Design a protein around this ligand. Structure first.
Ligand SMILES: NC(=O)c1ccc[n+]([C@@H]2O[C@H](COP(=O)([O-])OP(=O)(O)OC[C@H]3O[C@@H](n4cnc5c(N)ncnc54)[C@H](O)[C@@H]3O)[C@@H](O)[C@H]2O)c1
Ligand SMILES: NC(=O)c1ccc[n+]([C@@H]2O[C@H](COP(=O)([O-])OP(=O)(O)OC[C@H]3O[C@@H](n4cnc5c(N)ncnc54)[C@H](O)[C@@H]3O)[C@@H](O)[C@H]2O)c1
Ligand SMILES: NC(=O)c1ccc[n+]([C@@H]2O[C@H](COP(=O)([O-])OP(=O)(O)OC[C@H]3O[C@@H](n4cnc5c(N)ncnc54)[C@H](O)[C@@H]3O)[C@@H](O)[C@H]2O)c1
Lengths: 342, 72, 336, 336, 335
């Protein structure tokens, strides 16, 4: 009776703060399992357990050096074992999961994990394999543009002693051909996809502090109603600043409009700028509709709770918790209808 | 940690000297990318413990006077 | 004839021994105690207590392994790690986990690894641990579950009269405050603690604290999920705690109707679990009251017509310790 | 400048003199004291306060009918009956009623017939008495009224942060309970008392008491008439106290927005009257607080969409005594 | 400019810092604090205190390893093992031992083993260790002693008004009973503890406990070897305590002559250590008193002609901390 959620990521396994918002949305907290391997990429919550797709790796770190395959390459991952354990986890059967330690790089003795209330599979190939794609009850993939990704790499990963500035550009240029063919075309399968881009308000500075973000939601998905701005189906450009709400530079901008996303029908939600304070954070959330919120300001309370985390005031985290609440509403409707048939 | 990052990134730079474009470069750069992310999570966990050592101490010893948290 | 053990010989563990001893016709035979202090202390602190007085029983040690109460021998084994306990050697059936750390499934299961048939957690269980409170969902218990949790003394007091309020009146949303006695977690003088509020001196201060009590009532009554939340006030009294809960009901009512609803509910369905007091009383009067919740008839008042405030007294140690004995009696009633 | 006398050298009377002493260019000049204890006790108890510590001033008796506080000499008289008091001779313009005995207009008007111009009392008056709260109702004072009241320690703490909620949000109905420190009216050990819950030992009990504070704030804010109700809970702490308030507002809101409204109002127009506390704190940290109310931001909590709970701290002895000084300065400013 | 640091940030650790902060010109500089405590945890306990009130300074954290106190920054290291502490790296001269678990030469040597040049134990040391009381045993100190112990709270009170009593009247025999305030030693409610008396609830009742302070005065006053012994009674008050000494003096005297001796001794010899009080006070009025002992003049009785009963108060938290600050000044001036 468990629920499978797929999320693709490039930066790291659990490195994204996306997971911290989702666990907190539907759990008190999430933590690594007690005892066992100190490098276990698994996270355990009351209802949530995060699963690392890096663990289902056919080759150790030593093995891939003697081959042409990258970590993103399909041959390095074995989907045959991954699908077996997930299908066993779906029905409620205990599993044995190997561990890919990022430090040592050698496959460790397998850890066992019990079936969760909600299962999420973080990694790089949730929707790449067609067999696993059916098991997924929800598909998420956040697209990080090369300009903002390179920006994020410099602002956070340049401080390491060994790295040089142009050496970092040499890293993502090597990762681009493998990522473009094997990771990027997963955008069509994703039920909801978040793009991040440099802002158009300020003169295009690539620090990544204030970015431009679009939320693309597939329409027609069961137990899923897309968030809309003032009207479902129309095209709106709204700037919230004015007579009653006054805020400083750079500002805030929104764009709700329908779109065609790889022969699908979607409605996009764009946000460009950042939140200077609380007053426009409620003002923005108040006017949005189909939020799947239990009470007034639930989105604001979850963001202010996690404000110190990176990207909690620029709209990235705002759409992350909005998507996070949607998984909950998807979860509660689905288990209720399953219970009637059960 | 960072010393093994420096060794990996030096050898990855030297491995690309033999081949401008090859599959050995993408092998060398993939490792360096994984090591840098590995150092980042170790850096975050070191910083996270320094502000609150007791919650890590209360992780192993919850019966001591500093660590007891009874409700009601 | 169930062999019951006590793993935490703290405030609740000693009351559980005092409550089991005072009872007649109980299927529990206490044969095992696990205090880190040893036999010398467990013999002494059980005999003399500051809040309950001297035990009316010839409590004296019998060797360096066991103690004797009124002729009955109880074994004292001191071991911090519960997995190494000789539970299988003694053959104990239930474990009264009163330590207060092993509130998770993994920690309490170390008793099951030692040969315990069942474990009762005196704290509200962490994670997907089935929480049963006596008087509300007591019949929901089945023998299949190996680990069960009896909820908080706040919840054990909050759940019964909330059950009366939800059913007869119809509740929409409620806020709770509990003025609680200080507990062992608080420091006596200011020193380091995980919670900075608890770290301050308990005897001199009103310490606010976080409790999941109002959120834990959702576990025993599924209707109230997302309808309640609460805080706690730790006042310089040692034993007696009082909780006040203000709700927004659906049925327009007045004050004395709420009291009359707690009297027929007392005699009919909650006899021995819930009581109502109509005399001007203070905290010390409610010492050693077996009723898990005791309403104060004078103080309840409804503002508007559907916002009801009702406050109730309860004994945090003794009143809750009895409910653990009642719960273990229910466990002993349904065996195999 | 203005001749002011004190009738009743109690906790409020002693705190008044020390709060007035610390002020700068305060128009009032204290000339007389009326305490039945005598000069030896008033001089000693002024210097040595158990709650507030010693007085950072030289206090020595001058002659045998007066005391000298930091050079300034203050006549001290002792009499139960205010009609015999020499307010004619000393020509006192403002007499302060700290006894707590004369709260009716008939009884507390004896100072006027003794020769006093205006009397302000430190308790909620009985009958028709104008009741003011600094920062809420003190801006509508007419000099013609010769008997005034500064409302109680809770009512002075309630009205400022209650006024903001009604203005910004709008309240339908609300309730409160104040976990108050104990006071002089309670008995130290159990002995005869007309209010039986006050007869009990204050040091060992949680004494619950009916209060007029929630009903008295309707005299301060007219649109809140018949919408608030409250009862008090007295716990064994000497000085500091808390009050939590639950109200059903009309405008939908959540927790943090209420704090943002309180913080903005605390800086805008309730400066020096309201402060918002963002740190995890405890009662003694609010000893000798100059604000009428200090909201605890961590405990503010809403349920549903329109039920708001707010916890506030107040120093009943000192913080209320500061407002009595500030109200007396208000009278002296437009004194004509 | 002597670099000192604290090993325990409890009651005596915090009171030491605030006593050092009150000094107008001191040769001590605090750099590090060792405790089982975080930066936000140690700073919040320093600023706000349930006993002495709010610290009158600007206390805030500077980084995740240090705090800011009135513009001065001190690092906060957190390691329970002293032998693994970074003392040589910061340049520590002496270390205040306030943990209470290192009072033996084997244990307290883990600081000098780690880079300390001296340590000051805030407890009666176990075994052969120097025991010094300010105003009585302050002179007999040399730079040679690497480990020194300031005596217990009631010893720093008992030695001053006995040293004057022994020299001017002669002490044949005597006993002592100090009604002490409850400390962090006892338990809030009845819990597990090895001392069956202290294991019981501290806030509720009186607790008799043994004390070595009556014997410990022979360490500073060798003229009293085997003539004083006594016990202590823990009472439910937070901070300040009182002592009661009844000795059988040799020279015949009356009661007023006893108070006359303390008045004259306080004016010249024990100025700053001993004081006499004549007004009818209670415990709370002696908070933050810098004198190690304030004799209650109106309570001094004499029975027969040679039995003298004297009562004196002391702030064990504050007054004893000031003696540690004053004794630490003696270490600096003799460096
Ligand atoms: N009034 C109450 O105290 C009350 C009321 C309701 C629920 N509860 C909950 O029930 C539990 C009972 O707590 P308490 O009042 O006994 O606290 P307590 O401070 O009295 O308990 C301390 C005792 O726990 C024992 N202990 C600690 N660690 C141990 C270990 N590793 N192995 C074996 N024994 C160990 C010690 O022997 C000690 O005597 C608490 O966790 C509390 O959350 C308490
Ligand atoms: N709890 C508080 O601290 C507090 C706070 C705010 C307001 N109040 C209100 O303050 C008033 C005073 O409180 P309090 O505790 O200071 O009073 P108190 O109990 O301290 O007052 C006793 C003082 O009044 C003197 N006194 C009593 N009767 C007298 C008489 N007939 N003539 C002259 N002197 C007399 C007494 O000897 C003593 O000096 C009460 O009205 C109380 O409601 C109290
Ligand atoms: N009241 C007095 O003046 C007095 C009287 C007798 C003895 N003492 C001495 O002072 C101590 C009493 O101090 P207190 O009880 O007021 O303070 P406390 O016990 O309240 O605080 C001590 C602090 O030291 C820390 N600590 C404990 N063990 C440690 C370790 N191994 N490493 C690092 N830090 C550690 C703890 O976190 C605690 O916060 C006694 O043990 C004795 O040594 C003081």
């Amino acid at each position: 009776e468990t629920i499978v959620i797929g999320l693709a990521a490039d930066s790291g396994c659990g490195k994204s703060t996306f997971m911290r918002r989702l666990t907190s949305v539907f759990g008190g907290a999430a933590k690594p399992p007690k005892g066992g391997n100190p490098d276990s990429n698994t996270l355990i919550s009351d209802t949530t357990t995060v699963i690392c797709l890096d663990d289902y790796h056919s080759l150790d770190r030593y093995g891939r050096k003697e081959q042409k395959v990258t970590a993103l390459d399909p041959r390095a991952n074995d989907f045959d074992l991954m699908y077996e354990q997930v299908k066993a986890l779906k029905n409620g059967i205990a599993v044995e999961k190997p561990i890919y330690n990022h430090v040592t790089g050698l496959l460790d003795p397998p850890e066992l994990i019990q079936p969760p209330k909600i299962l999420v599979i973080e990694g790089l190939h949730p929707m790449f394999d067609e067999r696993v794609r059916d098991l997924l009850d929800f598909s998420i993939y956040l697209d990080i543009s090369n300009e903002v990704k390179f920006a994020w790499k410099i602002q956070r990963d340049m401080a390491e002693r060994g790295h040089s500035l142009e050496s970092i550009k040499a890293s993502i240029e090597a990762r681009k051909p493998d990522f473009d063919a094997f990771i990027d075309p997963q955008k069509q399968y994703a039920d909801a996809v978040i793009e991040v881009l440099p802002t158009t308000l300020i003169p295009d500075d690539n620090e990544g502090k204030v970015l431009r973000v679009r939320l693309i939601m597939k329409e027609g998905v069961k137990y899923f109603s897309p968030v809309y701005l003032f009207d479902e189906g129309s095209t709106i450009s709204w700037i919230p600043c004015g007579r009653k709400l006054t805020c400083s530079y750079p500002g805030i901008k929104f764009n709700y409009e329908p779109d065609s996303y790889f022969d699908h029908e979607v409605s996009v939600l764009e946000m460009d700028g950042q939140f200077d304070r609380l007053d426009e954070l409620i003002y923005v959330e108040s006017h949005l509709s189909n939020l799947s919120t239990k009470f007034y300001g639930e989105v604001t309370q979850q963001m202010l709770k996690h404000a110190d985390f990176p990207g909690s005031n620029n709209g990235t985290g705002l759409f992350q918790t909005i998507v996070g609440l949607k998984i909950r509403d998807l979860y509660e409707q689905l288990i209720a209808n399953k219970a009637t048939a059960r | 940690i960072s010393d093994v990052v420096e060794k990996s990134i030096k050898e990855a730079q030297e491995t690309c000297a033999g081949d401008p474009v090859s599959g050995e470069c993408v092998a060398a750069w993939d490792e360096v990318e994984e090591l840098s992310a590995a150092a980042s999570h170790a850096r975050d966990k070191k910083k996270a413990d320094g502000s609150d050592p007791l919650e890590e101490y209360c992780k192993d010893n919850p019966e001591t006077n500093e660590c007891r948290t009874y409700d009601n | 004839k169930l062999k019951v053990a006590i793993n935490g010989f703290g405030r609740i563990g000693r009351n559980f021994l005092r409550c089991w001893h005072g009872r007649k016709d109980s299927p529990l035979d206490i044969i095992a105690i696990n205090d880190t202090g040893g036999v010398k202390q467990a013999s002494h602190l059980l005999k003399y207590d500051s809040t309950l007085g001297i035990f009316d029983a010839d409590v004296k040690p019998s060797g360096e392994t066991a103690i004797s109460v009124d002729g009955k021998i109880i074994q004292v084994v001191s071991n911090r790690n519960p997995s190494l306990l000789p539970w299988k050697e003694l053959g104990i059936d239930i474990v009264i986990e009163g330590t207060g750390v092993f509130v998770d499934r993994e920690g309490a299961g170390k008793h099951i690894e030692a040969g315990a048939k069942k474990v009762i957690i005196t704290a509200p269980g962490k994670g997907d641990i089935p929480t049963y409170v006596v008087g509300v969902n007591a019949d929901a218990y089945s023998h299949d579950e190996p680990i069960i949790s009896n909820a908080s003394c706040t919840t054990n007091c909050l759940a019964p009269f909330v059950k009366v309020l939800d059913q007869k009146f119809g509740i929409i949303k409620g806020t709770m405050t509990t003025t609680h006695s200080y507990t062992g977690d608080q420091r006596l003088l200011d020193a380091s603690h995980r919670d900075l509020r608890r770290a301050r001196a308990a005897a001199l201060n009103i310490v606010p604290t976080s409790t999941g009590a109002a959120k834990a009532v959702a576990l025993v009554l599924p209707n109230l999920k997302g309808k309640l939340n609460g805080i706690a006030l730790r006042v310089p009294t040692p034993n007696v705690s009082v909780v006040d809960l203000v709700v927004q009901v659906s049925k327009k009512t007045f004050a004395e109707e709420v009291n009359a609803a707690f009297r027929d509910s007392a005699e009919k369905e909650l006899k021995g679990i819930l009581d109502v007091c109509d005399e001007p009383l203070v905290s010390v009067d409610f010492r050693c009251s077996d009723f898990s919740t005791t309403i104060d008839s004078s103080l309840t008042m409804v503002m508007g017509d559907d916002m009801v405030k009702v406050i109730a007294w309860y004994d945090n140690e003794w009143g809750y310790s009895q409910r653990v004995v009642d719960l273990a009696d229910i466990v002993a009633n349904n065996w195999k």
